[PDB]
Symmetry: C3
Subunit: 337 residues, 3 copies
């Protein structure tokens, strides 16, 4: 498209919402290509990531870890206003893995506290994609302080299976998984600090072990449970988008499956089917579609079960509806032999 063709397209402003929900959008595009406008404000903030009161100095797009999901259609333009408020201490930027050129946008969006910038890129490839901060010389430190999220670039005709049949979800959730590297003192207790830059050296030492102290969804142990358990009903079709900007993961729905999984996250790569556990490499997003068939509490985990049940990587779905005895029944409930 020429600059005059892009000038003539409609603009749409979107209000973002906190993960794991996703802002309003249409699965099939409503209209020709648009320039879709988003704004995120970077907040350097303390987050508490476990029930021992462990703290992280988060570097949080729109104040959440992960940052929020942006949704556009293929060949729309995503136009981001990124703001780095004067109350922050570090320079930040943004790399969209969905984008083409200038290190994903990072080369064009380096903003010191008190600056803003506006980047536009054409979303030429359909899929779910990581975005993350990447300041030269400090890249993994920002990413493993929670400065990452994902976008979804839907095909203009919505999702389809490998054979071209429509897949339409009722619900969509976004699970961002985070590896944290929290320094400990000589007694094994997690250290606290009064500014992000005070933890830097201690944290690089833990990062270089390649062994996270915590692996969590939505920024904390247990965050996607209780008030934030994800909801569905028997018969509803749910898309679960999962990202991990730095480290591999292997998502699994305990008691369910991934009926269709774009494990690579890319919708022109046909999805795998009937998955028990799928694999998303560090630096990517993936998406699984499932139709619930049984009610109950489900857990949703990274299936390194030490990562899930010792280090924090477990969420719940609460699912209403009628039990199906054909699919599963207790013929004899636990009872003396």
């Amino acid at each position: 498209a020429t600059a005059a063709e892009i000038a003539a397209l409609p603009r749409q402003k979107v209000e973002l919402v906190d993960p794991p929900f996703v802002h309003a959008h249409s699965q099939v595009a409503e209209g020709g290509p648009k320039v879709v406008e988003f704004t995120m404000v970077i907040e350097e903030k303390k987050i508490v990531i476990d029930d021992a009161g462990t703290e992280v100095h988060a570097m949080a797009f729109n104040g959440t870890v992960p940052g929020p999901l942006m949704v556009v259609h293929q060949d729309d333009y995503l136009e981001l206003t990124l703001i780095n408020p004067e109350t922050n201490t570090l320079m930040h930027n943004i790399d969209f893995h969905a984008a083409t050129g200038a290190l994903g946008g990072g080369g064009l969006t380096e903003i010191n506290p008190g600056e803003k910038t506006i980047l536009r890129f054409k979303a030429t490839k359909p899929g779910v994609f990581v975005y993350h901060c990447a300041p030269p010389g400090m890249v993994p430190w920002h990413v493993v302080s929670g400065m990452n999220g994902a976008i979804m670039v839907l095909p203009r005709e919505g999702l389809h299976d490998g054979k071209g049949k429509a897949l339409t979800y009722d619900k969509i959730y976004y699970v961002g998984e985070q590896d944290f590297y929290v320094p400990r003192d000589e007694n094994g207790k997690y250290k606290k600090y009064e500014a992000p830059g005070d933890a830097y050296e201690d944290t690089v030492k833990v990062m270089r072990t390649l062994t996270p102290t915590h692996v969590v969804f939505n920024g904390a142990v247990g965050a996607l449970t209780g008030d934030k358990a994800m909801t569905a009903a028997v018969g509803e079709k749910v898309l679960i988008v999962h990202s991990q900007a730095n480290r591999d993961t292997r998502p699994h729905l305990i008691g369910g499956h991934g009926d269709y999984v774009w494990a690579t996250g890319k919708f022109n790569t046909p999805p795998d089917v009937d998955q028990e556990t799928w694999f998303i490499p560090g630096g990517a997003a993936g998406a699984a579609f499932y139709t619930f068939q049984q009610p109950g509490i489900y857990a949703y985990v990274n299936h390194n079960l030490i990562e899930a049940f010792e280090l924090g990587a477990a969420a719940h779905f609460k699912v209403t509806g009628e039990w199906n005895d054909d699919l599963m029944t207790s013929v004899l409930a636990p009872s003396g032999t």
Copy 2:
């Protein structure tokens, strides 16, 4: 299917066999859906996992690590009687990743010592799938104590390649890979404990390093070697099911390939072909089909070679038959002069 329709189905009782063997089955289903019956007793038992004599309190379905492979066909029902004998100390249950509902059956099968339960599920999706114990609050410790295995839900029509041509194997093996996290003392020697519970706190510390001390097939270093090597002949078609309930692996047949690999384990996902090394994420099973072309000893490994040769993840195949110099020949054997060094 209604309760009445399920009741009218034929029942078949299977006698399980120990890994890496798989109980007798038919590749193509014989007749219509069935309720296929299995029984396993859980044994908490000390096992040795290396030639030094290192000792784990295993938590073993049917007394083996891995637990045995159960084979049914798509839309059969798998009906398991699971028994937790009164000589065990812990509650156990089972989660079938092939099943739908109640945490894969875990929510409906928590048995204390002295209890049994019968779970039935419809095997709706074809593939190989992990199963493992999962007591709430203690899940990884049971699974990395060996309490996991796999099932295979064959399509009713048997296996096919991605273009629909039949793939019929002559033998099958099940390789269960287990990461173990054994505590060490102040000088670096592995510790032994009187009961499973005495090991718990020291074992969780090693688990949280995410670094196994042992990574093994069939429960111990070298278990599938020597008189326990797997075997085949030139021309024979072998399916190798591989599972890992907790941690990634990357299987490889040294001197062979995976001609067709369902790396995800799911038979409605077309298999990769011509693979050197395939990848099975923790929490899953996969399957590779190969036709042997050359005789001799092969190794089958996790191709993190430190895991294979330092931590235990290496098996052998002994293959009989004639050597094929078209496929490979030593044009000049190692030769030269005997030099000082």
Copy 3:
């Protein structure tokens, strides 16, 4: 093929070049099956791998880490002369994951210093494949001392997408990624050793932690950056072959994609498309095809960004050509209240 037919095939000798470059070849085969002859000399030598002067006693096919890429077509034979010079100290051999039999050739190629051997195998399967040394009983030590590379067995009709359209690259690069395990003393300083065997017990202790001290391309931190960046132009089609003989990696082109990725490395498995980050398990090679669309500097990384930017696994591409403002533009450059 009868014995006289195999004996009558043409023999062609090919000169290797050092990674990340690849020897000249044709994408579509030229003529019928041939026996393609290569020779490699193994060098044991000390290499420096980071800006602190840390040393590895490298075990290097053809004198490089990784060893060079050999390129043949499907149903050619690859006939390698492997030479272990008398100034080396260790026995070595070679396992081609592309080959069938004898542990990939390792059982037929065990050569002490002062020996040579010639192995021929039929390249029956198309794809990129690891090769590595594997002396029984010391396999991971040789591989993590750098003794590994890859080959490419192209289909005779060249590459194609999943629909059958031809995919023809202008350029090809081979990135071999290496995990090293360098012992440290109790102050955290990397240790140095007189002879390669002197480091063996300390190095296996590091190996057993499963945590590399360094993760590098072309054998050293920074080897493919700066003035050693790989190059392309806007409009150019580039195939990037990547291998890792011992440990998983997850390549990513920062500011680009893998337009077609044979993530398994095998050309009869249809490529994934539009990839951000692909995944190559330890013990395999993979290949990504991309057409560059934007000029400027790119980084090409293992996207565990701690492995990329703390442990060494980052390369650059320098790309010439015109900026495309349709694909990306700065609507407002970084700014505070005033311009």
